C-alpha cells in the first residue's frame with residue numbers, strides 16, 4: 001500500500017525519518033524494501049540481521065539458495081528477491097564497506113539500483129559499521145536517486161545531524 005507517514009521532505013523525491021526500517025516495513029507494507037547487504041547475502045548484523053529476524057529467517061534461507069546457484073553479487077550491485085512478510089520485494093543492495101577498504105566511489109552505483117523502482121523504503125547505504133560518512137551517503141542518495149525514496153535512520157542523534165547538515 002506504500003502508506004508512508006511522519007517523514008521530513010528533503011527534496012521533491014527524498015524523504016527521511018528517525019525509525020527502525022523493520023517497524024516502517026510492518027506499518028507501510030511497501031512494494032520494495034531495500035536491504036543493506038554484503039556480496040554473499042549473509043544477513044547477520046545491522047539492517048540485514050534486523051530484516052532477516054523479522055522474516056523468522058525466511059530471507060536467509062531464500063538468499064542461501066540464490067547464492068548456491070548464482071554466486072555472490074558485486075559491490076555496487078543488487079538483487080531482487082521476495083520481501084516475505086515485510087514487503088512485496090526485497091532489493092538487496094551492496095554498498096562499499098570502507099572499513100574493509102572497499103572503494104567509496106561505488107556508493108553512487110549502489111544507489112543507482114534504486115532508479116529501477118518507483119518507490120522504495122530504504123536504509124542509509126554504507127553507513128554504520130560499513131564506515132562511510134553518513135552525510136556523504138545522504139548526498140550521494142539525493143544526487144543519484146530520481147525515484148521516491150523514504151529513508152529510515154534508526155538513530156536519533158544521527159538523524160538530527162543529517163537533517164541539520166542538509167539544511168545548511
Ligand SMILES: CC(C)[C@H](Nc1ncnc2[nH]c(-c3cnn(C)c3C#N)cc12)c1ccc2c(c1)NC(=O)CO2
Pocket residue numbers: 019020021022036037045046047050095123124125126127128129130152153154155158
Ligand atoms: C546507520 C544506521 C542507523 C543503520 N541502521 C539501521 N537503519 C535503519 N533501520 C535499522 N534497524 C536496525 C535494527 C533493528 N533491530 N536491530 C537489532 C537493529 C540493528 N542493528 C538497524 C537499523 C545502518 C547500520 C548498518 C549498516 C547500514 C546502515 N548500511 C549498510 O550499508 C550496512 O551497515
